[PDB]
Amino acid sequence: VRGTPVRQRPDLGSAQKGLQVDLQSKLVIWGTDVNVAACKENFQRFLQRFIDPLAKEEENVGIDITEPLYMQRLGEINVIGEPFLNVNCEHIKSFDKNLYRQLISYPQEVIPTFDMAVNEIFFDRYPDSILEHQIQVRPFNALKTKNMRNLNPEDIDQLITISGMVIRTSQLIPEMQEAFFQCQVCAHTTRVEMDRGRIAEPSVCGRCHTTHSMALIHNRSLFSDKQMIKLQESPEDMPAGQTPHTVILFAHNDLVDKVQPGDRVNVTGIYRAVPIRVNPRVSNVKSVYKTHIDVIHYRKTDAKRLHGLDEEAEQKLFSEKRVELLKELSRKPDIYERLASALAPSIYEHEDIKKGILLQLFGGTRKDFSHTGRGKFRAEINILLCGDPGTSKSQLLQYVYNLVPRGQYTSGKGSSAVGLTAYVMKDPETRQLVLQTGALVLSDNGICCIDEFDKMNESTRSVLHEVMEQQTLSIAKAGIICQLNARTSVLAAANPIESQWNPKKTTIENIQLPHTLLSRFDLIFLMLDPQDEAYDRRLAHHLVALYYQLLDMAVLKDYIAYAHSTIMPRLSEEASQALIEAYVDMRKIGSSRGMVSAYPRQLESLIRLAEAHAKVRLSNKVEAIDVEEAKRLHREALKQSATDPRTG
Amino acid sequence: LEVRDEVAEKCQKLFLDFLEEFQSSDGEIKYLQLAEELIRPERNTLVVSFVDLEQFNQQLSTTIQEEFYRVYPYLCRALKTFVKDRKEIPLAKDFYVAFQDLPTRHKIRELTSSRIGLLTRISGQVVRTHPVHPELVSGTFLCLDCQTVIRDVEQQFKYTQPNICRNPVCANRRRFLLDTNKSRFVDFQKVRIQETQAELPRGSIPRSLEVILRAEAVESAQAGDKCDFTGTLIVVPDVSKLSTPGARAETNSRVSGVDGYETEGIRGLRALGVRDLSYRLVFLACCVAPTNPRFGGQTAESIKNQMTVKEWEKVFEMSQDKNLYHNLCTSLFPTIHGNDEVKRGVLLMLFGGVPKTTGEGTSLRGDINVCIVGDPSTAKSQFLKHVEEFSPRAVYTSGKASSAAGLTAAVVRDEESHEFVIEAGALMLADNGVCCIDEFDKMDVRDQVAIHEAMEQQTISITKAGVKATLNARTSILAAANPISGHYDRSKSLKQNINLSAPIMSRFDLFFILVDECNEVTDYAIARRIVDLHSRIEESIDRVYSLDDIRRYLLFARQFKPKISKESEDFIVEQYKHLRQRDGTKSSWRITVRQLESMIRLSEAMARMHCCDEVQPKHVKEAFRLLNKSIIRVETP
Amino acid sequence: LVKIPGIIIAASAVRAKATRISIQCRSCRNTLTNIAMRPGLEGYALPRKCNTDQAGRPKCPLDPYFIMPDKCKCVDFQTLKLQELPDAVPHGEMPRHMQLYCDRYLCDKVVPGNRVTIMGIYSIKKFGLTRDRVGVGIRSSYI
Amino acid sequence: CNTDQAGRPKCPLDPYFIMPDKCKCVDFQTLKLQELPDAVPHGEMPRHM
Amino acid sequence: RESLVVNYEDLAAREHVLAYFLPEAPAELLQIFDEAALEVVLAMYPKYDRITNHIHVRISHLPLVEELRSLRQLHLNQLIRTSGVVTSCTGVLPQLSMVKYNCNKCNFVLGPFCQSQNQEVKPGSCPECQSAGPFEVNMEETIYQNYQRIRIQESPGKVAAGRLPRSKDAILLADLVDSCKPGDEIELTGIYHNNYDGSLNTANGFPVFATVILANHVAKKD
Ligand SMILES: Nc1ncnc2c1ncn2[C@@H]1O[C@H](COP(=O)(O)OP(=O)(O)O)[C@@H](O)[C@H]1O
Ligand SMILES: [Mg+2]
Ligand SMILES: [Zn+2]
Numbered sequence A: 001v002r003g004t005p006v007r008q009r010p011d012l013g014s015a016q017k018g019l020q021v022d023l024q025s026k027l028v029i030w031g032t033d034v035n036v037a038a039c040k041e042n043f044q045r046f047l048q049r050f051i052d053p054l055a056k057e058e059e060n061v062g063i064d065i066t067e068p069l070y071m072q073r074l075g076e077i078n079v080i081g082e083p084f085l086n087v088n089c090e091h092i093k094s095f096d097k098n099l100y101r102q103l104i105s106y107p108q109e110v111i112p113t114f115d116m117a118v119n120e121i122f123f124d125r126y127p128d129s130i131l132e133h134q135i136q137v138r139p140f141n142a143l144k145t146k147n148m149r150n151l152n153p154e155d156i157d158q159l160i161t162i163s164g165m166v167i168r169t170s171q172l173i174p175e176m177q178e179a180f181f182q183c184q185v186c187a188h189t190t191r192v193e194m195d196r197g198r199i200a201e202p203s204v205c206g207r208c209h210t211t212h213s214m215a216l217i218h219n220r221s222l223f224s225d226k227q228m229i230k231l232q233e234s235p236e237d238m239p240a241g242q243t244p245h246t247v248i249l250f251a252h253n254d255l256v257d258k259v260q261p262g263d264r265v266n267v268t269g270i271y272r273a274v275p276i277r278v279n280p281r282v283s284n285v286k287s288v289y290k291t292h293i294d295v296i297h298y299r300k301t302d303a304k305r306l307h308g309l310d311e312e313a314e315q316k317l318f319s320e321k322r323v324e325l326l327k328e329l330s331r332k333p334d335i336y337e338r339l340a341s342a343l344a345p346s347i348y349e350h351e352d353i354k355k356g357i358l359l360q361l362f363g364g365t366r367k368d369f370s371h372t373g374r375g376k377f378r379a380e381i382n383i384l385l386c387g388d389p390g391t392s393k394s395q396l397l398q399y400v401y402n403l404v405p406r407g408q409y410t411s412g413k414g415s416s417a418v419g420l421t422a423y424v425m426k427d428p429e430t431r432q433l434v435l436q437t438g439a440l441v442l443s444d445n446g447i448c449c450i451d452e453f454d455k456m457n458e459s460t461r462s463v464l465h466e467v468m469e470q471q472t473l474s475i476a477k478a479g480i481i482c483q484l485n486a487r488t489s490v491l492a493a494a495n496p497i498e499s500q501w502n503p504k505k506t507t508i509e510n511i512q513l514p515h516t517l518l519s520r521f522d523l524i525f526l527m528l529d530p531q532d533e534a535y536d537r538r539l540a541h542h543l544v545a546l547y548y549q550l551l552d553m554a555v556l557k558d559y560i561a562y563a564h565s566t567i568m569p570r571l572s573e574e575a576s577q578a579l580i581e582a583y584v585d586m587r588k589i590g591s592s593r594g595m596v597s598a599y600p601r602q603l604e605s606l607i608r609l610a611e612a613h614a615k616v617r618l619s620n621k622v623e624a625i626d627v628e629e630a631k632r633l634h635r636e637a638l639k640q641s642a643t644d645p646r647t648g
Numbered sequence B: 001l002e003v004r005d006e007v008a009e010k011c012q013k014l015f016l017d018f019l020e021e022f023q024s025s026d027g028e029i030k031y032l033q034l035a036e037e038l039i040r041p042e043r044n045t046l047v048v049s050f051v052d053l054e055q056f057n058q059q060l061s062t063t064i065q066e067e068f069y070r071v072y073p074y075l076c077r078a079l080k081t082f083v084k085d086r087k088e089i090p091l092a093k094d095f096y097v098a099f100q101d102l103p104t105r106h107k108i109r110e111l112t113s114s115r116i117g118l119l120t121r122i123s124g125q126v127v128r129t130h131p132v133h134p135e136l137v138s139g140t141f142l143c144l145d146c147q148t149v150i151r152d153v154e155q156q157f158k159y160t161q162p163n164i165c166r167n168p169v170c171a172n173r174r175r176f177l178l179d180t181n182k183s184r185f186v187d188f189q190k191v192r193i194q195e196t197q198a199e200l201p202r203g204s205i206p207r208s209l210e211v212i213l214r215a216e217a218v219e220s221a222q223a224g225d226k227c228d229f230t231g232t233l234i235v236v237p238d239v240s241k242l243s244t245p246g247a248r249a250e251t252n253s254r255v256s257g258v259d260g261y262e263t264e265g266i267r268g269l270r271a272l273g274v275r276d277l278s279y280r281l282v283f284l285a286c287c288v289a290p291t292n293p294r295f296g297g298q299t300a301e302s303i304k305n306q307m308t309v310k311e312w313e314k315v316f317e318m319s320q321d322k323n324l325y326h327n328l329c330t331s332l333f334p335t336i337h338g339n340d341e342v343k344r345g346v347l348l349m350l351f352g353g354v355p356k357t358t359g360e361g362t363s364l365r366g367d368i369n370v371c372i373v374g375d376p377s378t379a380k381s382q383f384l385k386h387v388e389e390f391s392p393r394a395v396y397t398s399g400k401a402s403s404a405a406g407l408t409a410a411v412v413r414d415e416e417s418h419e420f421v422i423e424a425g426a427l428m429l430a431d432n433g434v435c436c437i438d439e440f441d442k443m444d445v446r447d448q449v450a451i452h453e454a455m456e457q458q459t460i461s462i463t464k465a466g467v468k469a470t471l472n473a474r475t476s477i478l479a480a481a482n483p484i485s486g487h488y489d490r491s492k493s494l495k496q497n498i499n500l501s502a503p504i505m506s507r508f509d510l511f512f513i514l515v516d517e518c519n520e521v522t523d524y525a526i527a528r529r530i531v532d533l534h535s536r537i538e539e540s541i542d543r544v545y546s547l548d549d550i551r552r553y554l555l556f557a558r559q560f561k562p563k564i565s566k567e568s569e570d571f572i573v574e575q576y577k578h579l580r581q582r583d584g585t586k587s588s589w590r591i592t593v594r595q596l597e598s599m600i601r602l603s604e605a606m607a608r609m610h611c612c613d614e615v616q617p618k619h620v621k622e623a624f625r626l627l628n629k630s631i632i633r634v635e636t637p
Numbered sequence C: 001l002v003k004i005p006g007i008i009i010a011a012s013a014v015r016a017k018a019t020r021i022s023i024q025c026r027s028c029r030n031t032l033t034n035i036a037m038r039p040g041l042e043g044y045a046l047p048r049k050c051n052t053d054q055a056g057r058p059k060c061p062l063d064p065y066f067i068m069p070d071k072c073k074c075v076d077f078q079t080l081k082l083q084e085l086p087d088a089v090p091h092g093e094m095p096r097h098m099q100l101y102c103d104r105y106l107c108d109k110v111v112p113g114n115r116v117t118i119m120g121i122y123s124i125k126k127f128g129l130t131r132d133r134v135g136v137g138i139r140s141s142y143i
Numbered sequence D: 001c002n003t004d005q006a007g008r009p010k011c012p013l014d015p016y017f018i019m020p021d022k023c024k025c026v027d028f029q030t031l032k033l034q035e036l037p038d039a040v041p042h043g044e045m046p047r048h049m
Numbered sequence E: 001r002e003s004l005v006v007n008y009e010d011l012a013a014r015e016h017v018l019a020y021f022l023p024e025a026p027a028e029l030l031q032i033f034d035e036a037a038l039e040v041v042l043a044m045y046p047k048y049d050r051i052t053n054h055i056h057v058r059i060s061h062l063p064l065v066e067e068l069r070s071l072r073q074l075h076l077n078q079l080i081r082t083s084g085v086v087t088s089c090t091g092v093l094p095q096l097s098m099v100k101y102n103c104n105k106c107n108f109v110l111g112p113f114c115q116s117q118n119q120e121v122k123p124g125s126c127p128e129c130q131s132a133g134p135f136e137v138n139m140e141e142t143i144y145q146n147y148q149r150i151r152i153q154e155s156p157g158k159v160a161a162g163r164l165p166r167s168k169d170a171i172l173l174a175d176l177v178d179s180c181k182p183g184d185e186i187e188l189t190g191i192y193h194n195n196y197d198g199s200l201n202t203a204n205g206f207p208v209f210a211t212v213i214l215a216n217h218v219a220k221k222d
């Protein structure tokens, strides 16, 4: 301690008596076996003497491996000024299992001892540092709870980690922390801090000794911030018949607004059971308690997904060695082919489709057109797949859904317009009418995979026009009218008329989609079936070897994140001329009868694909090779070559 | 001894010194000159520049910013003394201090609890504005147990009775009677604002909060406007229906109930005075200004005065500039190739005609409506977005994303009184402006009927949830329509091509057809324009007039109401005869007297664009040419 | 007494309105049979004190009386909603309304839709002189 | 009445009667004490407690 | 007709001091004018007392005409002139004017209590049995007065470019009921009034006051 204020931690809940009991007739806390002194000493020992043996430089960026990890963390804290120390419960478990167990089972008691230990170490060292408040230790990566509904009541008020998807986040709730009372006779002022969730009012003035003259001034008090996170749990242990689970989380004073709807997170927090009043106006409480999680730590990192927007935005994400490795990979000649083959390793020989998916993941170049007065430009890449229910179109959509962060899924008629855009529901914890988002908005800066796009009624299909054209969503209903942002990438999958591609019909009628809807797509892949014995034999061997069973996903994630962070391709003169020529030629070829015609929307599609290829190469400059690849992909997809003026 | 708030009193003294000593460049007492106007009734606020305050005394400005809530009453008292020692304002009159030009601006997402009680400025979009009710600021109560008068008890954004009767031997804490004739009130309005489009994070609804406008700021924010509110984030207690117990306030006196009166249950809670502490963040805006003012400073003369010298000189130059028509077209749509007729029509829509009411009361429509129907990917949505972005009071909506209530209006009941607030719809927010309906054909008849009534009688009648009203909606319509089957057919009529109801179509002043002719020259030109736009983003746009200048010119010209001279009448009738003779091949739609009315409105719009006081044969000729070009022939094999 | 023309647009079910009640004290069980209820829309405030305390020195409580249901002389009563005649409503106007209280043999005498003439007492509800409704001294009128 | 009412009509205003059987009573005596005759001033009536 | 219309213009021309006093203290000056006009009309026609025993003095041609959007707490308890279009108009309800009560403990008839527009008259004890018993209105002996509640909003023609019309409630008493109809364009001279019962003293509510206009004069323009 250096005189810096010790900030109250609402995430730990209202304090307790902290009663101490001697176990002999050593000095544990009542109901626990923590022994604050021993716990603090052991945590200081862990913090000053922990080395991760099998750590990796890739895993730990900006950290000297040999030097104590959390001491380096304290150095970073001193450099920056944010008094939050993120500690790994797995590291705690490895160092001392008993300390890990005590932390897990008694968080509200153990954690403040960790705060004391960390502050002692951090002010014994760096004795001149300035911080707005003492350091707060945030544990995380507890032993994952597979299914949150396997939690028994004997697991209440203890630390757990869950994985979920953020469905909704409420407005900020001002939580009082220090009531400011003032006498209405002599104006003497006093302050009362939250004792155990209750503020014992003065009841008598300490200046004029008048009884019940002290009025609580609301706006001269000290307040905290609270937020309610409605998170749909994403359990990995799903027993027969169990349905999706929605859980309530509460974030306090710094984790507020740190997660937006659509974000997949690992939340570490205290499992809290609370009473429910039978009525809002009575103090009777039902004998059955409803549970919710008090959040301690958000974790946006997952090993089987790409990097989120926040992770990409953060600068110190890659080491210099990793950056150089990524640059080398981009410097390789066939990086495009390598990444495409990396995509979906279990699906055989869809090279063009996987290239389209890769360009979709990389996106285009985000551009600002505010000055032009032109309206936002969609930098996302929309892809349609077409083929009977015998091809891997649905498998590709599922793979993209399981891969990308902010991935939403829809299928057939299981969706509606309001359920894809927004609606109004009475929040069943505040009894207030709150607005809720649809799948498209939940996948705002991600991908919406829409299977069975053909069997999708016009009422819900017509919403996608606005999303795929302007990236906005102007909901104008009774209560409030507002223009939400859905900058989503559409990955649609549609079946041919009569659920098979009959070679007696032309492509447009076989597809059976409006010209406007098809033009809104910048890629269309007709997953036709070639009656090739070679293809059939290769696929059969592939599947049998799959039954009796590379470019690593980690470096794939790193490449995509680096490209999004830094590479911002721009148009060169040769690329501009190539694009103009390509658009003219595309119009000429597509001016036939049954072919999918071409429009300025197709020109913009070529522009986006060229920018995506430039990103794939880390070029930062769109040029002739990029334009040529865009043209070749846009042709091979939709198979302009195999077609003819006599379409069919 | 009535403990003194020394910090606040020091702030009051310093602020009074600032008022009575600060001077402008001229060297006179600017705030003395301003307070000279405070003597008049219905005028009780003084506007003070935070820039001026910071210049005069940085420490005072920082103190005010960091302790605004606690010191604000003292600043008001300082201003009251400043006004009194000069003039003879009524003794009971109150004065308020509005602050403006605060250097820093925060985001509604950043309005955390740490911002409570300290000065801040935010930008928001007004959703709806409640009426102007008197509010209780300090009431004098009567005790019903001993008839003791407890005087000047403040109200903390809630009806607060005296915590205890003054009489020492009387512990009355319940039975008080407010004395209205002795209490003081202030003007009060609650306005719901929401987060602007730019500030939205990913996948989030625009956060909404209500701001409280006190005296002299009480009818300055209107629904749909972008406004900067400067004031103080506050917390107002609320009885929230939280099922779970939370924070509670109770007395520290260690009383306990005797047998038969055990202080338990509801009796125990009422004895201990347990009351839940639930709060909601509210904004107490001391001033409101437009986020992007049109003028640096509602008839033509008033607009002229509101304009600055430089702004008026620019407007006069543009008015005197021949070729202003083409200049404005290019500036409005620099990034759209071709479609000169469409650009001209949209410009004439933005300008509008002169609405009139006959002696019998018939309201002759004065604003023109334009519908663009064309092949896919022909810049219809782009025209709509251009107009929405440029024009003020320019609402945008899709064909099927809106309901009738969200497209015309809705009714809610004032949560603070018996009256009814009207949640304006898109056609109301676009009042005296433009409404851009994209995918116009794809709209249900249940909404097309509302749009038709709007375009018909320039009004929206609402009879819902206990209130009847007749809102005015003088909004032009810009529609985008897809032909049946998607592609326009040149061998059919416009009615056969589009599926808009005949009453809807009949009153569209202009109908522009954008047929996607697969022509090499146009393909190359459009490709060049698009690739140039995507290569040279910030450059490549050279609009001879900036959008702000065009907006100011529109606001000035709209105040002009062109006449129609006898020569103009003769030319008009001759042109109508010529158009009828054209009607007599087959046009995509016939020519009726509605075409004559549209032509008259277009001529008025041209005269207004040139700011002429008389409609001229040149304007009439331009309108007739535009209409004739719009009406295309039906080519058949 | 007023005679008015109208049309019945509704007719509530026929329910039982007490004309006499017998109230029994909880302590001494003594009764106050045959208390004459007023006719129409009006309530009765029960006695607060058992007047028959002379039968014994120890006293009965405050507000001791419970109404005995089986000792009540009830009658049929009905509520109807009269609406002004459509040919009587002026051109641009709303149809005025009135509430009708019907008694023993006026119950079910008319049904919704009948154009009727009602002769009755113009009376206001008398039920104890106790957001909207900003008026004061206004009570629900009825015939 | 303390009893946790079960929704019935509440007990009367003054419902409580002493149960003389269920009481613990003790002896209690009242005495008169007088100022000692010597302690009384010469011309003064004795005080009593 | 029980009503007498007096031009404020002539009132100021002849006696200007009362003209100045009128807007500041409308209730008291109107009451005094009521009594004076009653005495004058009685002197002119002594036999008229048997007709309503009460005369209402309406004021016309108020110089300053406010607007519904421009009514602020500064105007409270003052005679303001406004114009508007009636949007709603409830039926002519009967209101208590000189209320008599029945003590439902001895059946004595508690005498006539004048009913004010701002407070529900409630008696204390019964003068005979000195009981605070329930009491109940004696409709047979009570004398009533017509009460109509209208809502007048800003004329859409007068509403500004960007703005929604604002509405104020008004009360018509015993001579003005059904003097206006929904849709009528009316000038209303009346007391912007606040102190009857309108105060959001409930939880989740700013201490704002509802307001009404005690219509003293109505003039349709058509
Ligand atoms: N004539 C043109 N000039 C400039 N841009 C055009 C033109 N035609 C098409 N475009 C471009 O092609 C896209 C299609 O325009 P859009 O408004 O979607 O047409 P539609 O209304 O038919 O959907 C837009 O991004 C636009 O910038
Ligand atoms: Mg479009
Ligand atoms: Zn005091």
Ligand SMILES: [Zn+2]
Binding pocket: B143, B144, B145, B146, B147, B148, B165, B166, B167, B170, B171, B172
């Ligand atoms: Zn008292």
Ligand SMILES: [Zn+2]
Binding pocket: C025, C026, C027, C028, C029, C030, C050, C052, C053, C060, C064
């Ligand atoms: Zn009894």
Ligand SMILES: [Zn+2]
Binding pocket: E103, E104, E105, E106, E107, E108, E126, E127, E128, E129, E130, E131
């Ligand atoms: Zn009596």
